[PDB]
Design a protein around this ligand. Structure first.
Ligand SMILES: Nc1ncnc2c1ncn2[C@@H]1O[C@H](COP(=O)(O)OP(=O)(O)O)[C@@H](O)[C@H]1O
Ligand code: BEF
Lengths: 84, 95, 99, 563, 111, 88, 98, 111, 96
DNA sequence: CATGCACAGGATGTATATATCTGACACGTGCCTGGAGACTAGGGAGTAATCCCCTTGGCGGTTAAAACGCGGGGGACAGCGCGTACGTGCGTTTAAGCGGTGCTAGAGCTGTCTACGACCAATTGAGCGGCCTCGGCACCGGGATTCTCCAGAGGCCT
DNA sequence: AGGCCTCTGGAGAATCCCGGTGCCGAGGCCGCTCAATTGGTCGTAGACAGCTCTAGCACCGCTTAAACGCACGTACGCGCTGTCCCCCGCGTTTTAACCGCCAAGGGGATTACTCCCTAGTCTCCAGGCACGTGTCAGATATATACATCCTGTGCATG
């Protein structure tokens, strides 16, 4: 029954650097991190808000992987490896 | 406990052993294949349903399936799939 | 003898060659789990998360961010620069039709 | 009593004092009187004299008589583009004391003419207006609408045979006191299209379309007990009723009894046989293979190899009729894509591939041996191009008219060819563009390269070289392809004529054909078929000349008009 | 008197299960009738596609001197080929990684 | 006396002429245009058209007709990913 | 000398006009000929209703217009104002169409 | 002795046809069977959306000093709102223009 | 021979218009576009509800599925007003 | 006299090769539930026969875009110089990560019972083809208002 | 003696409203009929209560890899100038769409008639799915040989 605050700061800079390298970037500016965090939050909000809606309809109280994989498929991107 | 769940596990293994005699597969790849088969099946059936509906037909016949394949698969893959389907259906009737 | 030190830019290429070979996960576990839990608290008050869903969410997020950065890098070369800047990300997201 | 000439002169002077170019003929004077009577009684009417009898001069005389009494007024004349200059010249010749203008040209020029010569106030100096169809169609709404048109003459009336025609709708904006509708072939293919002219001329009478449809019976019921003789009785009654309801509004006269001094003419059909080259194309087209005439691996483990699969290590009946017609006309019309902009084949190769072209080449050489001059008609310009190229290769003179030739160029060539000093002997014409109005009395022979679906069109084309002023016998040669689709179209065409003969009078298992169509004409017969002696006019008191050649024979057939 | 039963898959010569596809089609409410011919066609098509993918995956695996397939191999096989990549234009494979690729401008000057 | 050269017509793809491309560009909000775009636009358009004509023809073929109709084009567009109103 | 505008003025005037009208821009008959030519490759002797040709036109025109709109942003990005082919190629590449 | 019949739409207070929606929903095989409450719920939503779009369309048409609505008005009404625009993000409307706008950089200098 | 009739929402769309702008009228093309719009919306909602019901192994379709589908599809504020309208309609229908 | 190229070694960061040892992946049973033979009604769907619409090929004419050609201003590229804002390293800190135990809470089965929703017949009237009639728009033609674009005067200097 | 410019101050060219006739597509009206309504059964999905028992949510401790601050250079980003070719604007003509008009006939829709595939029941039985074991690929440890990146003299200035 605790409360959570300011966890978005947990995406450390080296993690973003490592993510960028896999994409083929060579040299990175100083202002990218703040933009990236906002983009990530915006992306997550939409998926969570549909997974929750799917769950509540069946009157369950626990979210399950099937709901998440269902939610993604509606937004035009499919995921292989968790169910069908 | 022990309530059965169905999947395409055995047939993928049979095909694999038919192609590469000595190779094996880990569980993760098995899950990916199991999902891929369902996805393709659903796509084809969904397309065939509306394709039949547009013409006031009631049944779903082999012709609808043959037409549906030519719309989904791109270019080269279309030819061989149609050939295999026709061969299988032709062999089935005379048995 | 001076302490041997590479010229700027060399280590970046080694990192690029290394991280494109492996398939590990790049973000930490617990911080991401806490972040996921925090957001959902607005829509319902006592949600219970199955241990498998979090992995799927993390995979989707990483797969999205990697592609976004890849497109940004191409957008950057167009102006003869090599460092990516917020303008490039904004332009890429505008072109893709998300904004 | 005075002689015919003196009486005609006196009557003309009494009725048409302004007319000075030349004397009118008796029947022309009678037509003038008929028009005067119709005008006096305030009733419209059609004039349908046979082609080449001089309707223009009669209309000019009537107009001069009208203005001769001082009834100055705005007069409008509409005619096909190619004839306007002829109308202007006729007025300039016969009545020098009248003015006319050719209201034609670009917008700015038309406005200039309007401002200069057409004052808003009518006066004795007001000239007659002449125009084509399109100009009268575009400018009706906002320019010509502002005049009180006293009298209107619409030449070539048969252009209004469709009641849905736009031109027939635009004219309603104008207001006209009276209408006159000249023509040469009043009765078109079917009865419905005849009602349009009558409705336009006299709306107060022929209002209902369905009444006009039902007034005549074409049921063709079985010859039951009460119908055995009805087949003829009903037909006779219908014909009599039609004539009786059409007598008071139409004037008709025929050459055969009005101008006995004019030499006669004949129509002749000559056949040709297809060559092997054409048969090959026919067979390919029937089998749907004309284009063709002009035209697996196993991966390891035995599976079929997908095409262009990468192999690299991962580490590190729709239009058959028109096609057949094109093939029958000339093979080269097809295969127009193989050589693109490149040249036509060699001259000698063109002749050898088409039977009709071979026959035409054989026929032409003999005619020049006797100083004759010929006109050649066609429907498709691309076909005219091949003949033009052939004649240019042979180095002969040529003159040509068609839709792509401008007005002034059209006018110049006719005048040049009519000159007696001209050495030209070949003249080309398009059927639709040059078949109407113009005068080409210089020549005395006509050739029809192909037959239209509508027989009436050909009748206009044949008469372009047989009219008042001619002095020699005339022959008309129509070519056709033996044992081909051409016969079907030609057979169907004449089927539409029987209705005309029924309705309009002259005043107010091989079959025999298979034994004749196939036979090509031999040289001995051909050199004998060209005699025109029998068509000459007999001297008074002398017996008629005997028939030159039988009615029909191998490869040829004369045509006798239905009577 | 009953003759010995033979599975439809055996008579058609395929490997995939014909009966299960037929059951799925009817229970899926795609239409109120299902012809006798469709299941065989569908099973044959699915078998062909599966064999096509597995043949390339196996070739990819043997290159690295491994013996059992893992997701990286499927990712390589799918993304290297032409048609398959177009077919799977919007699919993400768990733990797939990405193909090696570096823009030419970033490489060090040859000098 | 026409010369022995046949008549010739411009290639069909050339029917789309430069002023039309310029007019299209202006509606997009373009001020200055380079000289080479006139060869890229035609290439793009020709590629675009086939991906729709093929599906339209397949839909027509399935129904055993011989004439294409509006509904086939609408269905092809909708399946490809773009929806069109005003022709149903 | 005769009145003569400076470069660039007429383009803005044309832009402010063509954005106000809804009529079609490409001529009809050439487009119909092109459509007939392309289809004939896949199957012979087809027949087209007019409304199908109209639909194809109005579908393609609005695609080209949008493509040109997305291209212009790239040009401004590189500090230029003219369009060049590389811009179109980059726009299509990012869109994921190739 | 049956009483006077009253349409369900009149009983519910809506304008759209309940019966036609119910028939379409049944015959379309969207599910095995249809409850009694669904068509009433669906008709209200359809009516609300139609009225919502028509109000803006009419306002835009009136603003231009004209009486009858034409597609240009629908285009202007739809594309000027940030919600209807998101709902119709992929739809194309025949004979509709585009919103007028010019990038600031292209405008001429102050002089 | 006129047996081939066609059905459309023209009458109802026209009826709704008079409730907002009494003195306005609509041309044919706008009517056709509006008619096409309704079919698209209806198809989307019904299609979503169909698969939503099957996911839980339930057989029938009830107002709950329609409500959830509407909540999923329509973005932002439109959801609230639509849901309120639907519930207000159904509650009135039931009581009579 | 401050440049441009050739090599030397010489420190680091990969891929060789050999040895240990887990814990998945492969194979066996023993049932069951679901697939596979016979049999019986029904009605979609195939197949003639027939109208009437709407499509396909070609000529005539006009006239408003399309093609060419010429001047000239400005925008697209090279070059150079200045000065930050990032990229390799080295210590110091902080928080993941692993490895064990407790609990409940909440997700799955099982057995009832009932209100809800398919089907049939008999009814009407709400919804669709036709068909007039008139105003909103659609030309025209003519006088305003905006907006560019270039030459001369004199601020304030040099 | 000579600039560099605002600021006019016109002068020419493009929309813009304002009044006046013409026209044909929208809005009611009418007639007709086929698709919703109204009662009635009948069997069933679907609530509802009562039980198992799996896992997610906490807590504690401990090693110990990633974070997190500095303090240097340096190579890239940005701005300012020149030069030169290329695109825009405006005049003359030539070329091809738009209609207008001629003919014909293929293919789209209906309406009857008949039959052979599919649905829905029964038996009957064997193929696929949880539990259960047993080896050997592949993940780690270590020795190191090789390849790659970097700077400091060398040469040639002449
Ligand atoms: N009275 C005449 N004197 C001389 N030639 C005449 C006379 N009447 C008619 N013609 C000739 O009739 C020829 C054509 O006139 P016309 O018959 O009216 O043409 P069409 O009937 O075909 O419309 C003219 O060349 C003209 O010379
Ligand atoms: F008017 Be006529 F036929 F020259």
């Amino acid at each position: 029954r605790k409360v959570l605050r300011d966890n978005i700061q947990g995406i450390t800079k080296p993690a973003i650097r490592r993510l960028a390298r896999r994409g083929g970037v060579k040299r990175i500016s100083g202002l990218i991190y703040e933009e990236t965090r906002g983009v990530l939050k915006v992306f997550l909000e939409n998926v969570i808000r549909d997974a929750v809606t799917y769950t509540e309809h069946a009157k369950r109280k626990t979210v399950t992987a099937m709901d998440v994989v269902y939610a993604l498929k509606r937004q035009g991107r499919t995921l292989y490896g968790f169910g069908g | 406990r022990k309530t059965r769940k169905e999947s395409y596990a055995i047939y993928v293994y049979k095909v694999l052993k038919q192609v590469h005699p000595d190779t094996g597969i880990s569980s993760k790849a098995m899950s990916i294949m199991n999902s891929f088969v369902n996805d393709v099946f659903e796509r084809i059936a969904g397309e065939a349903s509306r394709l039949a509906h547009y013409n006031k037909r009631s049944t779903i016949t082999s012709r609808e399936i043959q037409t549906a394949v030519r719309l989904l698969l791109p270019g080269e893959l279309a030819k061989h799939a149609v050939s295999e389907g026709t061969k299988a259906v032709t062999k089935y009737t005379s048995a | 003898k001076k302490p041997h030190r590479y010229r700027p830019g060399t280590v970046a290429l080694r990192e690029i060659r290394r991280y494109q070979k492996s398939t590990e996960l790049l973000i930490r576990k617990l911080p991401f789990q806490r972040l996921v839990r925090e957001i959902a608290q607005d829509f319902k008050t006592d949600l219970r998360f199955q241990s498998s869903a979090v992995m799927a969410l993390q995979e989707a997020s990483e797969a999205y961010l990697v592609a976004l950065f890849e497109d940004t890098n191409l957008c950057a070369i167009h102006a003869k620069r090599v460092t990516i800047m917020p303008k490039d990300i904004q332009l890429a997201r505008r072109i893709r039709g998300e904004r | 009593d005075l002689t015919e000439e003196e009486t005609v002169i006196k009557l003309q002077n009494e009725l048409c004092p302004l007319l000075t170019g030349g004397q009118l003929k008796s029947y022309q004077l009678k037509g003038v009187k008929w028009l005067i009577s119709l005008w006096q009684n305030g009733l419209n009417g059609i004039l349908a004299d046979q082609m080449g009898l001089g309707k223009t001069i009669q209309t000019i005389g009537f107009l001069s008589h009208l203005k001769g009494n001082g009834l100055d007024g705005p007069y409008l004349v509409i005619a096909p583009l190619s004839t306007l200059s002829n109308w202007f010249n006729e007025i300039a010749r016969f009545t020098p004391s009248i003015n006319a203008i050719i209201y034609h040209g670009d917008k700015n020029q038309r406005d200039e003419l309007r401002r200069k010569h057409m004052p808003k106030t009518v006066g004795p100096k007001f000239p007659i207006v002449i125009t084509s169809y399109e100009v009268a169609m575009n400018d009706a709404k906002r320019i010509l609408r502002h005049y009180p048109w006293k009298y209107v003459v619409i030449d070539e009336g048969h252009r209004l045979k469709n009641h849905k025609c736009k031109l027939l709708r635009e004219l309603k904006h104008l207001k006209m006191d009276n209408k006159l509708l000249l023509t040469g072939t009043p009765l078109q293919n079917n009865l419905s299209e005849l009602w349009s002219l009558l409705n336009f001329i006299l709306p107060d009478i022929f209002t209902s379309h369905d009444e006009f449809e039902s007034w005549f019976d074409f049921s063709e019921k079985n010859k039951n007990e009460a119908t055995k003789e009805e087949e003829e009785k009903r037909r006779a009654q219908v014909v009599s009723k039609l004539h009786g309801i059409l007598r008071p509004f139409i004037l008709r006269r025929m050459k055969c009894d009005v101008e006995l001094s004019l030499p006669r003419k004949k129509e002749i059909i000559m056949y040709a046989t297809m060559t092997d080259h054409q048969k090959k194309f026919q067979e390919h087209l029937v089998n749907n293979t004309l284009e063709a005439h002009l035209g697996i691996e196993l991966s390891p483990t035995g599976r079929p190899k997908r095409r262009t699969r990468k192999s690299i290590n991962y580490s590190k009946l729709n239009n058959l009729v028109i096609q057949l017609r094109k093939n029958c006309n000339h093979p080269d019309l097809l295969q127009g894509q193989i050589d693109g902009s490149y040249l036509y084949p060699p001259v000698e190769e063109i002749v050898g591939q088409c039977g009709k072209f071979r026959l035409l080449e054989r026929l032409l050489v003999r005619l020049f041996a006797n100083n004759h001059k010929v006109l050649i008609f066609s429907q498709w310009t691309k076909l005219l191009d091949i003949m033009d190229y052939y004649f240019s290769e042979k180095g002969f003179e040529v003159c040509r008219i068609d839709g792509s030739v401008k007005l002034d160029e059209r006018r110049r060539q006719i005048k040049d060819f009519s000159d007696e000093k001209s050495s030209c002997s070949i003249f080309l014409l398009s059927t639709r563009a040059g078949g109407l109005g113009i005068n080409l009395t210089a020549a005395d022979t006509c050739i029809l390269y192909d037959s239209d679906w509508n027989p009436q069109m050909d009748l206009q084309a044949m008469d372009r070289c047989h009219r008042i002023g001619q002095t020699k016998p005339v022959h008309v040669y129509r070519l056709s392809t033996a044992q081909s689709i051409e016969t079907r179209v030609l057979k169907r065409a004449y089927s539409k004529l029987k209705l005309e003969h029924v309705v309009i009078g002259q005043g107010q298992d091989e079959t025999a054909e298979d034994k004749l169509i196939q036979t090509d004409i031999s040289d001995a017969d051909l050199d004998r078929l060209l005699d025109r002696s029998d068509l000459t006019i007999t001297a008074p008191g002398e017996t008629q000349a005997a028939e030159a050649f039988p009615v029909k024979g191998p490869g040829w057939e004369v045509v006798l008009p239905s009577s | 008197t009953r003759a010995k039963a033979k599975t439809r898959s055996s008579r058609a010569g395929l490997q995939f299960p014909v009966g299960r596809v037929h059951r799925l089609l009817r229970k899926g409410n795609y239409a109120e009738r299902v012809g006798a011919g469709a299941p065989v066609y569908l099973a044959a098509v699915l078998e062909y596609l599966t064999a096509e993918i597995l043949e390339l995956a196996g070739n990819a695996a043997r290159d690295n001197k491994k013996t059992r397939i893992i997701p990286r191999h499927l990712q390589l096989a799918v993304r290297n080929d032409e048609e398959l990549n177009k077919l799977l234009g919007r699919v993400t494979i768990a733990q797939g990684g990405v193909l090696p690729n570096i823009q030419s401008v970033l490489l060090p000057k040859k000098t």
